[PDB]
């Protein structure tokens, strides 16, 4: 015979062979290799995700949900935004820059977890039909240790990334609030509920200027100081 | 008509997904993605990897030359699939 070295292995399965295309093969059948973790089988061939004991591991790709201090369910154009009341009526809008920054950060986090899978071709046997003794016990022990360590790693990673994602999504809102407060130097007062009381006549043009980052506070200062004090 | 009000806020969704953090074990967020795959197609895809199916034929039986293993001569593979119906129909043997 001829003895080579390569990427060949063996597997026990009772599943039919199809005409599809997939890079991960499992005794239960082929599985997609986009997610980093799997709960199908410990026997894999190809670029397969790591086996973990858990069945559900959710990663947060959004901000906290506060239904009816509260969220706006009708704002379908962005993540963070403004709602204003003035002499010409009431209105609402969304801020594109902050929304895009948060989306970009979340997408960058996701791109480092989805699609990065290692290739393992030939490994040890993980299912036994007879009882032998010391070597089989050692193999079982090694596999159990590996599975437990990887499950712990998966849980800790999910918790860490969720914590930092929620922190950044809150930080974006705090940044927008502080920027708006700094823009209105002495012509507006904080009310403590996320709202600013602006002590001068504001049209749609002035609110658009505030949302536009082109708001000159010097023109509206004498009237605001007269009304505030 | 001498004062305006400007409020800042975020967006909510009707339904929501519960996730876990280091500090909070139950926090509801707008959107979340699963990181564990728990489903299979039920068939072994054969396009990228060369797959050799052994029915009624174990690998050692194919190597030795079983009467039912005559179709596996001079064959290559990337994954040999052994079935649970595999049996031997030649002289009894015992690999130490």
């Amino acid at each position, epitope marked *: 015979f001829k003895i080579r070295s390569g990427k060949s292995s063996i597997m026990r399965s009772d599943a039919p062979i199809g005409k599809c295309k997939s890079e991960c093969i499992t005794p239960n059948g082929s599985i997609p290799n986009d997610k980093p973790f799997q709960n199908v089988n410990r026997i894999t061939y190809g670029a397969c995700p790591r086996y973990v004991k858990q069945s559900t591991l959710k990663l947060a790709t959004g901000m906290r949900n506060v*239904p009816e*201090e509260n969220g706006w369910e009708g704002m379908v154009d962005g993540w963070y935004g403004f*709602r*204003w009341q003035n002499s010409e009526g*009431r*209105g609402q*809008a969304a801020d594109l820059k902050s929304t895009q920054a948060a989306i970009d950060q979340i997408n960058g986090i996701l791109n480092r977890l989805i699609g990065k899978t290692n290739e393992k071709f030939h490994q040890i046997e993980k299912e036994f039909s007879e009882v032998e003794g010391r070597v089989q016990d050692l193999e079982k022990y090694v596999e159990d240790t590996k599975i437990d360590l990887w499950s712990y790693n998966a849980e800790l990673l999910v918790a860490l990334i969720n914590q930092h994602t929620i922190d950044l999504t809150d930080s974006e809102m705090n940044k927008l609030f502080e920027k708006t407060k700094k823009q209105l130097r002495e012509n507006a007062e904080d009310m403590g509920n996320g709202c600013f009381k602006i002590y001068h006549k504001c049209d749609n043009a002035c609110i658009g200027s505030i949302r536009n980052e082109t708001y000159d506070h010097n023109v509206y200062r004498d009237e605001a100081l007269n009304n505030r004090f | 008509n001498s004062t305006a*009000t400007l409020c800042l806020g975020h967006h909510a969704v*009707p*339904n929501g997904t519960i996730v876990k953090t280091i500090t909070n074990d139950r926090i509801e967020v707008t959107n979340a993605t699963e990181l564990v795959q728990n489903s299979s197609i039920g068939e072994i895809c054969g396009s990228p990897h060369q797959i050799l199916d052994g029915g009624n034929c174990t690998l050692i039986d194919a190597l030795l030359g079983d009467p039912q293993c005559d179709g596996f001569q001079n064959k290559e593979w990337d994954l040999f699939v052994e079935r649970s119906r595999a049996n031997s129909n030649c002289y009894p043997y015992d690999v130490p």
Partner: antibody
Amino acid sequence: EVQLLESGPGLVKPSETLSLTCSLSGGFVTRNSYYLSWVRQPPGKGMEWIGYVHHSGETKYNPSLKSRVTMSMDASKNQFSLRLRSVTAADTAVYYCARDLVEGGYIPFSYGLDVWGLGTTVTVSG
Amino acid sequence: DIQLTQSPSSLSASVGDRVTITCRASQGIRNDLGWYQQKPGKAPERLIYAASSSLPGVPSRFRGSGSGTEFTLTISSLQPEDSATYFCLQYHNYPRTFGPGTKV
């Protein structure tokens, strides 16, 4: 998202009560900003508001339908139903169930009829 | 009740021209006006909610502008896909009066 689906009799004999139900998928009926409303359109005429119901046990109907209208809401099933008591030939119409969004805060802001449902035809005849 | 009236009806136009629909209210409202589109045999779809605020997915041809007791919906270009009924909604008060549709 939030979708609504309508179900009920397509034909009602005169001088009888007409009953319809609207079921909600993708959200909860017990939210403070949901005002579930019923609208109707006779063929060839304008569209008419019937009334709305809210999870706080508050209802509000159109004065034109003075007393022969009632609205109920079941939270355990995520449904809300409409009943019309006395029926004439002027009630032949396409009925829609819609969801209104009136949000609160320091600056209350309404959005109108956001989510609509596929209308059901109700024909009144003997 | 705040009655709503629509000035144009059964309007016919070319493919690539400009059209306008006007909604007037008997009583004074303040920016509370929505513009809806209804194709024959289908449910209405919301186009404008704050009367100067287009929703995601609405093509750029549609625009809305107005206040008080006068509101307008303007389309700069008319594609063959946009041939349906259009109506206006008021939500300042609860009776929720509509307006008779305008056919394009």
